[PDB]
């Protein structure tokens, strides 16, 4: 507290769980198909493709801090509902959605 973000620990675990669920949904999406894919595999698959080109994507001459990375991860995590988000506190999740 005082040298880092408060929701950076829960945001990294939620982004890691959304990345693993996006990798499992992307791997199961090829076998299941496009017309038979689940909503969780498509929602996690869109968050994996959007998070792979947004969070990991950076500039060679641009400097991004952890506060801008947490705000950029909050925009990728904002597509999921509030009921499907349980790796953070309710005050930090309601304040930063």
């Amino acid at each position: 507290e005082g040298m880092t973000r408060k929701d950076h620990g829960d945001v990294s675990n939620q982004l890691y769980a959304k990345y693993a669920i996006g990798k499992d949904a992307a791997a199961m999406k090829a076998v299941v198909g496009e017309e038979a894919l689940s909503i969780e595999d498509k929602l996690s698959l869109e968050f994996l493709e959007k998070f792979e080109k947004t969070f990991i994507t950076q500039g060679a001459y641009e400097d991004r801090t952890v506060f801008e990375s947490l705000d950029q991860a909050w925009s990728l995590l904002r597509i999921y509902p509030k009921e499907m988000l349980n790796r953070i506190s309710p005050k930090i999740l309601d304040e930063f959605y």
Binding site: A30, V31, V32, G33, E34
Partner: protein
């Protein structure tokens, strides 16, 4: 400095390739299964690196080349084609989206036109940068037009039958020289840009 490495032990655990891989700045891949299948010279999209692409992109911006933009999408489609072929061969052919089939279909023509060389093409004496950069624009425009047509609502057989002569002309365009029409660009690249809108509009509608 172009020095070919040979086997002196294992496949990648040799000391000449391991010690030479650190001092080098550009690395190219090599398919072991595709090399025995008569498909040389083959390369691997997962095993490759280059540090002069950033400095070469500055002079390429002054030269107006589009080689790296189509090379990144061709490397991404070639990277996803191995995972789609391995997942299709391992899991079994029972269901799949049109994006993986269009990516494997574009990777088959891109691997046939770019992978096949040294005995599989008529013109191999000289390769201009405008013909190589403009050659990937037809495959990237066909894959992006097929993915955009399938994303906006369309069938896979309606788009594949909607392409028709464009897929055979894009695959057979490597045999033609770039000396037709202009001195650096062929007429098939200019006609393919006008025919791609009619084929994409006819495939979607």
């Amino acid at each position: 400095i172009v020095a070919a490495v040979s086997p002196a032990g294992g496949d990648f655990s040799d000391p000449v390739t391991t010690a030479t891989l650190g001092i080098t700045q550009v690395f190219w891949g090599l398919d072991k299964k595709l090399a025995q299948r008569k498909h040389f010279p083959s390369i691997n999209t997962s095993v490759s690196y280059s540090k002069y692409t950033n400095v070469l992109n500055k002079f390429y911006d002054s030269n107006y080349p589009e080689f790296p933009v189509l090379r990144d999408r061709m490397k991404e489609i070639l990277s996803n084609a191995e995972e789609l072929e391995q997942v299709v061969q391992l899991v079994g052919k029972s269901a799949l989206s049109d994006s993986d089939k269009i990516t494997l279909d574009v990777a088959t023509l891109i691997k046939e036109d770019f992978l096949q060389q040294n005995g599989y093409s008529t013109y191999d004496a000289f390769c201009p940068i405008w013909k190589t950069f403009d050659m990937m624009r037809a495959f990237i425009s066909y894959h992006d037009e097929a993915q955009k047509a399938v994303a906006n609502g369309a069938n896979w057989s309606k788009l594949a039958d909607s392409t028709g002569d464009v897929k055979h002309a894009v695959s057979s365009s490597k045999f033609f020289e770039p000396s037709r029409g202009e001195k650096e660009v062929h007429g098939e690249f200019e006609k393919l840009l006008s025919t791609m809108q009619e084929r994409f509009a006819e495939s979607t509608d």
